[PDB]
Amino acid sequence: SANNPWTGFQIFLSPYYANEVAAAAKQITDPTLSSKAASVANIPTFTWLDSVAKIPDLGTYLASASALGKSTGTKQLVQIVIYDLPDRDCAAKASNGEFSIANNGQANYENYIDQIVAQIQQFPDVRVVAVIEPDSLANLVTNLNVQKCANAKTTYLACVNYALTNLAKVGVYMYMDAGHAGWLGWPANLSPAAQLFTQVWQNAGKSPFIKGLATNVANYNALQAASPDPITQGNPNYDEIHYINALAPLLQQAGWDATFIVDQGRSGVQNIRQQWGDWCNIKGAGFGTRPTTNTGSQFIDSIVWVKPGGECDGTSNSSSPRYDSTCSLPDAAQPAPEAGTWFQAYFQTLVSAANPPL
Ligand SMILES: OC[C@H]1O[C@@H](O[C@H]2[C@H](O)[C@@H](O)[C@@H](O)O[C@@H]2CO)[C@H](O)[C@@H](O)[C@@H]1O
Ligand SMILES: OC[C@H]1O[C@@H](O)[C@H](O)[C@@H](O)[C@@H]1O
Ligand code: NA
Spatial neighbors of 169 by CB under 8 A, at least 6 apart, are 117
Could you tell me if 147 and 102 are in contact, meaning their C-beta atoms sit under 8 angstroms apart?
no
Distance 50 CA to ligand 2 centre (A): 7
Nearest Cα neighbor of 240 from 170, 311, 289, 169 is 289
Does the bond joining 124 to the residue before it have cis omega, within 30 degrees of 0?
no
Cβ neighbours around 153 below 10 Å, total: 15
Distance 339 CA to ligand 2 centre (A): 6
HSE (side-chain half, CA atoms, 13 Å) at 112: 24
Q: Tell me, using a 6 A CB cutoff, whether residue 54 lines ligand 2.
A: no
In whole angstroms, what is the distance from residue 151 CA to residue 49 CA?
24
What's the DSSP call for residue 328? Answer: G
Nearest Cα neighbor of 97 from 56, 31, 55, 50 is 50
Q: What share of the chain is helix, strand, coil (3-state, %, to 5)?
A: 40, 10, 50
Resolution (A): 1.4
Select from 20, 45, 47, 50 the residue to mutate for testing ligand 2; criterion: most ligand atoms less than 8 Å from CB. Answer: 50
Collect contacts of 197-203 with beta carbons under 8 A, ≥24 apart: 197/137, 197/251, 197/256, 197/258, 198/251, 198/254, 198/256, 200/137, 200/157, 200/160, 200/161, 200/164, 200/176, 201/176, 201/256, 203/157, 203/161
Range of the domain at 89: 1-358
In whole angstroms, what is the distance from residue 329 CA to residue 327 CA?
6
DSSP secondary structure, 46-82, as one string? PEEE-SGGGHHHHHHHHHHHHHHHHHHT--EEEEEEE
Select from 95, 183, 267 the residue to mutate for testing ligand 1; criterion: most ligand atoms less than 8 Å from CB. Answer: 183
In whole angstroms, what is the distance from residue 243 CA to residue 245 CA?
6
Nearest Cα neighbor of 247 from 238, 258, 255, 236 is 258
Q: Tell me, using a 6 A CB cutoff, whether residue 311 lines ligand 2.
A: yes
Spatial neighbors of 350 by CB under 8 A, at least 6 apart, are 266, 268, 285, 286, 287, 309, 310
In whole angstroms, what is the distance from residue 341 CA to residue 77 CA?
25
How many domains would you assign to the chain? Answer: 1
| β 10-11/76-82 pair status | parallel
* Nearest ligand to the CA atom of 275: 1
- C-alpha pair distances (Å), 52 with each of 109, 112, 226: 9, 6, 42
Amino acid at 190: L
**Phi, psi at 41, each rounded to 5°:** -65, -15
CATH of the domain at 244: 3.20.20.40
First-residue to last-residue Cα distance in the chain = 31
305 assigned binding-site residue: no
Q: Tell me, using a 6 A CB cutoff, whether residue 95 lines ligand 2.
A: yes
DSSP secondary structure, 235-279, as one string? -S--SHHHHHHHHHHHHHTTT---EEEEE-TT-SS-S--SSTT--
Angle at 211 between CA 160 and CA 109, to 5 degrees: 20
Amino acid at 20: E
Cβ neighbours around 321 below 10 Å, total: 7
Q: Tell me, using a 6 A CB cutoff, whether residue 135 lines ligand 1.
A: yes
Distance 88 CA to ligand 1 centre (A): 13
Three-class secondary structure of residue 35 per DSSP? helix
Tell the residue nearest (CA) to atom 7 of ligand 2.
340
242 assigned binding-site residue: no
In whole angstroms, what is the distance from residue 140 CA to residue 117 CA?
26
